[PDB]
Design a protein around this ligand. Structure first.
Ligand code: NA
Length: 123
C-alpha cells in the first residue's frame, strides 16, 4: 500500500536522524570505553551483575536494521550503557567517571533530538 510506503519513509528518516545522534553521542566517548560489548571472556561474571548489557556497536546494529521505532527506544538503550556502567563500576573508577561525563554531554544532544523528532514528526 501507499500508506505502508509512507510509514517506511518516516522510519527511514528517523533512522537517519538517530544515526546522526548516535555519532554525536559516541564522539563524547573518545576513550571508546562504551564502543563494544563488555567481554564475557575478560569479565566472566558480568551477566550475574548486569541483566541487559548494551554498547554503541550493538545499538548501531539495531539502528541499521531500522529496529528503533521511536526516539524513546533509542534513549532506553543509551541509558542502559550509562546505567550498567555506573552499577558495575565504583565511583572512583575511570569507567564510572566516563559514564557520568557521557550522560551529561549526551543530555544536550538528546534534548534537541527530541525537538527535531517532534518538529519533523518522525514517529
Ligand atoms: Na556499584
Amino acid at each position: 500500500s501507499m500508506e505502508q510506503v509512507a510509514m517506511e519513509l518516516r522510519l527511514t528518516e528517523l533512522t537517519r536522524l538517530l544515526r546522526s545522534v548516535l555519532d554525536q553521542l559516541q564522539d563524547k566517548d573518545p576513550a571508546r570505553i562504551f564502543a563494544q560489548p563488555v567481554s564475557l571472556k575478560e569479565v566472566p561474571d558480568y551477566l550475574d551483575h548486569i541483566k541487559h548489557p548494551m554498547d554503541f556497536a550493538t545499538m548501531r546494529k539495531r539502528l541499521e536494521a531500522q529496529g528503533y521505532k521511536n526516539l524513546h527506544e533509542f534513549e532506553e538503550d543509551f541509558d542502559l550503557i550509562i546505567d550498567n556502567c555506573m552499577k558495575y563500576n565504583a565511583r572512583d573508577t575511570v569507567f564510572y567517571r566516563a559514564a557520568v561525563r557521557l550522560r551529561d554531554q549526551g543530555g544536550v544532544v538528546l534534548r534537541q533530538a527530541r525537538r527535531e523528532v517532534d518538529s519533523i514528526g518522525l514517529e
